[PDB]
Write a protein that binds this DNA or RNA. Structure first.
Ligand SMILES: [Mg+2]
Ligand SMILES: [Zn+2]
Ligand SMILES: [Zn+2]
Ligand SMILES: [Zn+2]
Lengths: 93, 98, 171, 84, 174, 64, 268, 105, 549
RNA sequence: GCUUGUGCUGUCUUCGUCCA
């Protein structure tokens, strides 16, 4: 599903179909993010039910996101080049 | 092992000409040795020492085995070639030109 | 120590409950999910004030799943211990390593290394107790202890007290 | 604050095609997940057809929140938007 | 589970010493700071509650909920059983027992007089609400005892602590 | 596991009578048999088959 | 370049930053699938033909409405209030002719894409209400005047009571109102189309409904649609022209291949 | 600019509706100066870094955004596409809420 | 519902805040320190701790679990480590920016060469945009070549002359006009010195330069500690049945770690400055080519085979890069492709689908009381008969593969479960032909299951697709949800696309022999007898049963 | 007494198919 097909689906106005194509029919992934630093550095043990961002030293302000696996890979490669992409779930102003 | 069948192989691990083959069926049986695990704790005849490296038929193809070649390579190990034959009849969607 | 706090909860409702009794069902679900819970950030939530007249607002339909998400804001009474605070307690169990007390729902453990030496543990006593010449502390006896450390769990709080300082011990 | 009072609503009073498609999809999904139906179905079984029947009779229990570019919004009921 | 009305608090570089919880230093953290905000965003003060005020509030709320659930038609056990959840029932039973066995003021009018004395007083206009709750809860008898139990009151020597304690003992039912 | 998997079989009834095949899948009575000449696999009930043995063709019941 | 451009619920065209690109999409707020080529009847012709087609004089007997097309043909001559209404209509038509001929279309072109096909609506009304036969019409002239005038103020592109909103709304429907007034003229309705009361009300309601249906829908991604609509002809295709000239235009090249001036001289 | 684009399009007899070319030249002249449809024109805007990097000069744009501590507000379609979210376009330009008042019937 | 339950609330991303990573943050988010170049412990499995494949960095194996989070390969995202560098090095992407900042400030007392007293500087301060603010400040302070000890009253200036700094390779040279002509000395500006100078810059001066105190600090452009990506970023491949080859990034990290140990040992034991310079330039080269191997004016880092090293930068750019190749467009599931054929007996919005494609593709239908009987009939039919089904999905998400189920006839369906039934008649599907020049290249059709292996189209839709039947192929996409099906059937359907917005005219018409025949049949001298008239009238689906006179 | 096994490389190069 190339870029031109994406533009055609934008021109149709079908946002739900585009989201389903690019996530459910493809690399859908779930990550946890700290609510303070906004980094994907949370250490989650789901069956032990314990979450922790060791850097920010917090256990309660943690959320889960559904993002493409390629987006996760891109953010990790950016982090490898010392760039800090921080994902926040609220606006500031 | 693979999900395909192995009953069409002979003792030497090679299929014989004249046999029907479907997709994924195994036509060349090959194994490579592997250092055995702690299964020497006792497994009389069922301890794994080999890993399967067999050649399956292409999943979209089927036909008859036409000829099986056996020889040795330049170095000196065995070397096999299997030829499959099938007939293709014209149908809707086939390309023709003048 | 008890406090009044403005709390919020996110409630997700399945489409099978989209009926006229949606508001009341959300209220009872909120009550069952809030009353008696223990969160380390806040402490212990004991009751919710005005529990039958809480505004729930309009729920937002989650895209791709149909279920509605509600933001419910409420005021509740919350209790949380603090480091270096002196509170009363009631002894619940006696052990050679120390005694276990109860401060409401919170259970506080005090080790012998935070107990004065004259309060020697007597296991032969009926019931077993940490007793001195003029003091006798056993199960059900009023004790005043100072909280030194607090341990936070996933949905539990563990507190450690001490009675080695003045104006503590038996009361 | 961001909400706009019902008397001074200035957006179009007609249901756009995107809103119609999204409302039909959401209602069909809810019906397929065992939500109560508000219209009498004669012999219909398909959730999308039941949702379309609900829309034609103005019985869909959903609200459309239209967002303005500055951040404010207007709330419109599915029963007060004209559908062709 | 439940989320406070205070949000944001993103990453920075500076570290402060007023971050650890400590009753003695009167550092209650951001979520229990002296300044709070309601659902409307207006200014709001931290609301401490003594055991008398807390007991009155929990009894009032519980009896209101019990009356509402019964169609508008006193025992602690039945009132605790009104609530739902076995762990919730145990927690409210433990709180009811703790409050009952340490209730300094079981009367509404006595609690009202105590709150008015501890709020409208000129000396108490500077007192932190946590200090007020601790004084009304612990039932101290001496200035030295109160200072030892509550180290924050040591730095506030402009408070008529002894006469306030004697008034509290007088209001306390023997 | 059925005793008829990967065994040469002959069809005795229906529209494919007298065609030699090999049993590939056998779950509940609907044996999947590949046909030697038509490059295809067809479903067939166990009643319509004839399993080869050392002494001529045997029916399904008389073999299992 | 155009991917993030969308029509919003206030009618404006904006990008992802909220910067306004157009205060109304297409300067008329219409969908690109809802317009057809129509002729504006006040633009072409001579002054004699325009006067003959549109002017109705109730004093001169040979330059009035015909007597076999109206049942009220007797008590019509000599009226002054009705003559004032007809004069107001004619002055509005003359203003429209001046506006279109002098500001909008100066070369006389009058076949332009507009919404709501009026010819189709008129012939549909004629077929539905059986407007054949020499039967006189019961449609009074003030009814025609007030119906057309009210119709020309219900074509809502923008909603609101602000004065700027009203000015933008009046601006957005100028050409379409000119088309409607040129078609639904009193003499034309009475003689060429021969509508009656029911047919007239049906035509007015149909025009209003179809104009409401021709507006662009908020949420449209008109930027991507414009990009595809411009790039698609480029796929199937001494002054440089074609793809190199399109590249020069889109890159804003400083040194184009064939610079040129178009110099116009004074009349003499 | 509209006249030149119209000349180029209409020379070979083709026809394009006015609104498309009007939107194009309005984007090309909205900033007060001529903005070319190139990386020098498009990527010198105030749009989000994630939206600009997906066109051209990805790594340079990301390095500049990191060094400048840029904040992407994720309002564009490209950011939501590459984050796997419902883009605020078409059917995603509004929210759907549950009507409790109507449900009483 | 394909992910295991988590008590963390589910939210979406509203803002992305960019910035640089500080050494404190790199150390804090790390789970292990990497100091051993050897990948394998003793060539006997169980990779060495503290190495580049430490088991705390994450698990990329089926049977092994991550020792940091305890999750399996499918769920573990990977964890970062760090690698302390013996000497600081330049970040290859920020060297011109470091040069410009060095021009902007004073190399001895870390202060801007000009203050707000200059009105032009105040105007440069006023602009909010950090890039333009930095540009203006740089355009001003570049001219100023001397720190001012007193105000042009002491501004704190040390008075020293500002050198001219020129870039060559990755090395900056600062030419001081030491005290008309004299002998000027150009000395190397080592990364440690610039780092120390940047560290003294006040926060307010940092803000004046367009940097941010919290997220983008000027001394963080110098690498003192290197974050180590998890194995998920740099997976190993299986070259043959036995030997497995390491990723390029792993080899480059091994080279970096060897150079670091070399620098450290050299400094500790004995220090001839020339050898220090050589080995430290080798370390700088390795760190620079680990991130950017397309550096102009110097040779590329090569593999043992002679192919150049694949750097991180080259993973993110081009058609096959991360952005264009895996985010703006990707490969998707639930799709089909085959040759297309014409069908005069199909409706305009219908598509003919081969039976094998209908068996392969599926739609997950929710079990309700309106369809439970039909769905259990489909489940009884199985995955090899049409109409059948392939999977039964429980509420908890467990799939039941109907191929390998011995009691598929004894499966009872509960309300709320999902059945992945085969593609059926009248299911909406999206149909597409490349290149997709306009939005009529993707339209939603209705499925009709037919024999033979081609897709079938009405001939009037061949114009918007620009397709013919001499070998063309077209793609098909199956929606997987009720909302997505409604979107396809109400927005993208073929009848809704008849009139295009490009030229406000139809894009579909009567074509080819239908056009020729309609011209021939409507000629004035064409007459038809009663029997043929009856046949043609019965051929009309919309005919009302009344024969005309 | 006897029970059916559960998956796949990477990187280049060349030749082709349908548009353009
Ligand atoms: Mg072709
Ligand atoms: Zn964090
Ligand atoms: Zn892990
Ligand atoms: Zn200086």
């Amino acid at each position: 599903f190339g870029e031109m097909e994406r533009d055609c689906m934008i021109a149709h106005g079908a946002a739900g179909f585009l989201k389903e194509r690019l996530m459910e029919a493809s690399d859908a992934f779930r990550v946890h993010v700290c609510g303070i630093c906004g980094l994907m550095s949370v250490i989650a043990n789901l069956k032990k039910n314990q979450f922790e961002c060791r850097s920010c030293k917090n256990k309660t302000n943690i959320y889960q996101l559904h993002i493409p696996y390629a987006a996760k890979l891109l953010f990790q490669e950016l982090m490898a080049m010392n760039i800090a992409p921080r994902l926040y779930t609220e606006r500031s102003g | 092992l693979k999900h395909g069948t192995y009953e069409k192989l002979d003792e030497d691990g090679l299929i014989a000409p004249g046999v029907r083959v479907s997709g994924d069926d195994i036509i060349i049986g090959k194994t490579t040795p592997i250092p055995p695990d702690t299964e020497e704790l006792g497994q009389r005849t069922k301890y794994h020492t080999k890993r399967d490296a067999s050649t399956p038929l292409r999943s979209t193809e089927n036909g008859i085995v036409d000829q099986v070649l056996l020889t040795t390579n330049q170095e000196g190990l065995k070397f096999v070639k299997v030829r499959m034959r099938t007939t293709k009849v014209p149908q809707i969607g086939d390309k023709f030109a003048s | 120590m008890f406090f009044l706090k403005d709390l919020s909860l996110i409630l997700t409702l399945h489409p099978s409950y989209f009926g006229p009794q949606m508001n009341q069902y959300l209220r009872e679900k909120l009550l069952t999910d809030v009353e008696g819970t223990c969160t380390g950030q806040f402490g212990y939530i004991v009751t919710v004030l005005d529990g039958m007249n809480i505004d729930v607002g309009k729920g937002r339909i989650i895209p791709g799943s149909g279920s509605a998400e509600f933001e419910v804001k409420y005021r509740a009474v919350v209790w949380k211990p603090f480091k270096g605070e002196v509170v009363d307690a009631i002894v619940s169990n006696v052990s050679p390593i120390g005694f276990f007390a109860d401060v409401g729902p919170l259970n506080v453990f005090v080790s012998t290394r935070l107990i004065p030496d004259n309060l020697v543990y007597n296991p032969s006593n009926s019931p077993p107790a940490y007793m001195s010449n003029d003091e006798l502390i056993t199960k059900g006896s009023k004790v005043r202890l100072k909280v030194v450390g607090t341990r936070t769990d996933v949905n539990e709080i563990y507190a450690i007290g001490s009675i080695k300082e003045d104006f503590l011990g038996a009361i | 604050e961001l909400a706009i009072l019902k008397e001074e609503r200035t957006t179009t009073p007609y249901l756009t095609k995107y809103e119609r498609a999204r409302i039909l999809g959401t209602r069909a999904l809810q019906i397929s997940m065992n939500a109560p139906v508000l219209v009498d179905i004669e012999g219909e079984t398909d959730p999308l057809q039941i949702a379309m029947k609900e829309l034609s009779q103005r019985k869909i229990p959903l609200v459309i929140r239209r967002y303005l570019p500055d951040g404010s919004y207007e709330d419109w009921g599915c029963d007060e938007l004209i559908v062709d | 589970v439940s989320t406070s009305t205070v949000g944001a608090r993103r990453r920075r570089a500076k570290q402060q010493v007023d971050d650890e919880e400590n009753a003695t230093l009167l550092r209650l953290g951001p979520e229990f700071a002296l300044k709070q905000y309601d659902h409307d965003g207006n200014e709001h003060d931290l609301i401490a509650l003594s055991l008398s005020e807390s007991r009155l509030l929990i009894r009032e709320a519980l009896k209101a909920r019990s009356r509402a659930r019964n169609g508008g038609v006193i025992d602690d056990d039945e009132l605790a059983k009104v609530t739902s959840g076995a762990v919730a029932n145990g927690v409210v039973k433990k709180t009811l027992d703790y409050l009952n066995t340490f209730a300094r003021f079981k009367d509404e009018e006595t609690c009202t007089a105590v709150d008015q004395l501890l709020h409208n007083s000129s000396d108490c206009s500077v007192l932190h609400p946590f200090e007020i709750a601790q004084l009304s809860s612990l039932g101290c008898e001496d200035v030295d005892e109160a200072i030892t139990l509550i180290p924050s009151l040591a730095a506030k020597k402009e408070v008529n602590l002894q006469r306030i304690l004697d008034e509290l003992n007088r209001l306390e039912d023997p | 596991r059925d005793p008829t998997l990967n065994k040469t079989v002959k069809i005795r009834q229906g529209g494919y009578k007298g065609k030699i095949g090999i049993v590939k899948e056998a779950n509940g009575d609907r044996f999947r048999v590949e046909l030697h000449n038509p490059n295809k696999t067809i479903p067939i009930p166990c009643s319509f088959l004839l399993i080869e043995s050392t002494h001529g063709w045997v029916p399904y019941e008389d073999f299992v | 370049a155009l991917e993030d451009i969308m029509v919003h619920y206030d009618g404006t065209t904006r990008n992802s930053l909220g910067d306004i690109i157009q205060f109304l999409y297409g300067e008329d707020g219409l969908d690109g699938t809802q317009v057809e080529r129509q002729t504006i009847d006040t633009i072409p012709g001579s002054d004699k033909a325009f006067h003959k087609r549109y002017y109705v004089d109730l004093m001169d007997e040979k330059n009035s409405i015909k007597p076999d097309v109206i049942e009220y043909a007797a008590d019509i001559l000599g009226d002054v209030e009705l003559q004032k209404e007809l004069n107001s209509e004619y002055e509005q038509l003359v203003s429209d002719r001046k506006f279109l001929r002098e500001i909008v279309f100066v070369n006389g072109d009058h076949n332009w894409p507009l919404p709501v096909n009026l010819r189709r609506i008129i012939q549909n009304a004629q077929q539905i209400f059986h407007l054949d036969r020499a039967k006189a019409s019961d449609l009074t002239i003030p009814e025609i005047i007030h119906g057309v005038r009210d119709l020309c103020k219900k074509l809502f592109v923008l909603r609101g009571e602000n004065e700027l909103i009203k000015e933008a709304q009046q601006n957005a429907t100028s050409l379409f109102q000119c088309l409607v007034r040129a078609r639904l003229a009193t003499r034309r309705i009475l003689e060429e189309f021969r509508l009656n009361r029911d047919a007239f009300e049906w035509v007015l309601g149909t025009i209003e409904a179809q104009f409401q249906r021709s507006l662009v829908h908020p949420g449209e991604m008109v930027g991507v649609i414009a990009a595809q609509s411009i790039g698609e002809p480029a796929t199937q295709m001494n002054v440089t022209l074609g793809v190199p000239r399109l590249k020069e235009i889109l890159n804003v090249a400083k040194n184009i291949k064939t610079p040129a001036l178009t110099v116009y001289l004074d009349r003499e | 600019l509209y006249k030149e684009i119209l000349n180029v399009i209409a020379f070979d007899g083709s026809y394009v509706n006015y609104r498309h070319m009007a939107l194009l030249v309005d984007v090309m002249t909205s900033r007060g100066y001529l903005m070319a449809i190139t990386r020098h024109g498009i990527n010198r805007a105030d749009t989000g870094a994630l939206m600009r990097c997906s066109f051209e000069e990805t790594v340079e744009i990301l390095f500049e955004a990191g060094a400048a501590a840029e904040l992407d507000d994720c309002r564009g379609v490209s950011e939501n596409v590459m984050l796997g979210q419902l883009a605020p376009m078409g059917t995603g330009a509004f929210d759907v809420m549950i009507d409790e008042k109507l449900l009483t019937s | 519902s394909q992910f295991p339950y988590s008590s963390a609330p589910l939210r979406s991303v509203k803002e992305v805040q960019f910035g640089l990573l500080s050494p404190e943050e790199i150390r804090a988010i790390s789970v292990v320190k990497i100091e051993y170049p050897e990948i394998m412990d003793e060539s006997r499995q169980r990779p060495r701790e503290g190495g580049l494949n430490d088991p705390k960095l994450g698990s990329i194996d089926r049977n092994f679990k991550c020792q940091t989070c305890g999750e399996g390969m499918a769920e573990c995202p990977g964890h970062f480590g760090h690698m302390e560098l013996a000497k600081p090095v330049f970040h290859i992407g920020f060297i011109p920016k470091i040069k410009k900042v060095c021009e902007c400030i004073c190399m001895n007392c870390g202060k801007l060469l000009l203050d707000e007293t200059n009105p032009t500087m105040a105007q440069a301060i006023r602009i909010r945009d950090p890039k333009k603010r930095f540009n203006a400040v740089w355009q001003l302070c570049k001219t100023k070549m001397v720190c001012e000890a007193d105000a042009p009253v002491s501004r704190g200036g040390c008075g020293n002359t500002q050198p001219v700094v020129r870039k060559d390779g990755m090395k900056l040279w600062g030419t001081w006009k030491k005290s008309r002509d004299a002998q000027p000395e150009r000395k190397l500006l080592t990364p440690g010195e610039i780092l120390n100078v940047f560290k003294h810059i006040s926060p307010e001066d940092c803000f004046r330069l367009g940097f941010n105190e919290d997220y983008a600090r000027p001394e963080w452009m110098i690498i003192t500690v290197l974050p180590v990506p998890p194995p998920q970023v740099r997976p190993s491949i299986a070259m043959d049945e036995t030997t497995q080859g390491q990723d390029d990034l792993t080899h480059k990290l091994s080279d970096i770690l060897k150079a670091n140990i070399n620098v450290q040992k050299l400094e500790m034991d004995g220090s001839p400055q020339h050898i220090i310079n050589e080995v430290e330039q080798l370390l700088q080269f390795h760190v620079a080519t680990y991130m950017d191997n397309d550096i102009a004016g110097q040779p590329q880092a090569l593999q043992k085979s002679g192919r150049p090293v694949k750097a991180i930068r080259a993973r993110l750019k081009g058609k096959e890069g991360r952005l264009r190749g895996n985010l703006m467009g990707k490969r998707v599931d639930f799709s089909a492709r085959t040759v297309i054929s014409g069908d005069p007996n199909l409706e305009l919005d219908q598509v003919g689908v081969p039976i094998s494609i209908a068996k392969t593709l599926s739609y997950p239908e929710t079990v309700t009381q309106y369809n439970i009987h039909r769905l259990t009939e489909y489940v009884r039919n199985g995955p090899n008969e049409h109409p059948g089904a392939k999977y039964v999905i429980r509420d908890n998400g467990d799939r039941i593969d109907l191929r390998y189920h011995k009691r598929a006839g004894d499966i009872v369906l509960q309300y709320g479960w999902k059945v992945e039934r085969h593609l059926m008649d009248d299911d909406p599907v999206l149909f597409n032909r490349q290149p997709s020049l306009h939005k009529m290249s993707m339209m939603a059709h209705r499925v009709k299951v037919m024999p033979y292996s081609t897709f079938r189209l009405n001939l009037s839709v061949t114009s918007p697709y620009n397709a013919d039947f001499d070998g063309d192929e077209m793609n098909l996409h199956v929606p997987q949800s009720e909302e997505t099906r409604a979107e396809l059937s109400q927005l993208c359907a073929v009848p809704l696309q008849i009139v295009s917005p490009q030229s406000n005219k139809p894009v579909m018409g009567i074509v080819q022999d239908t056009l020729c025949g309609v011209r021939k049949m409507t000629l004035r001298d064409t007459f038809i007898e009663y029997e043929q008239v009856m046949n043609m009238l019965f051929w009309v689906p919309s005919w009302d049963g009344v024969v005309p006179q």
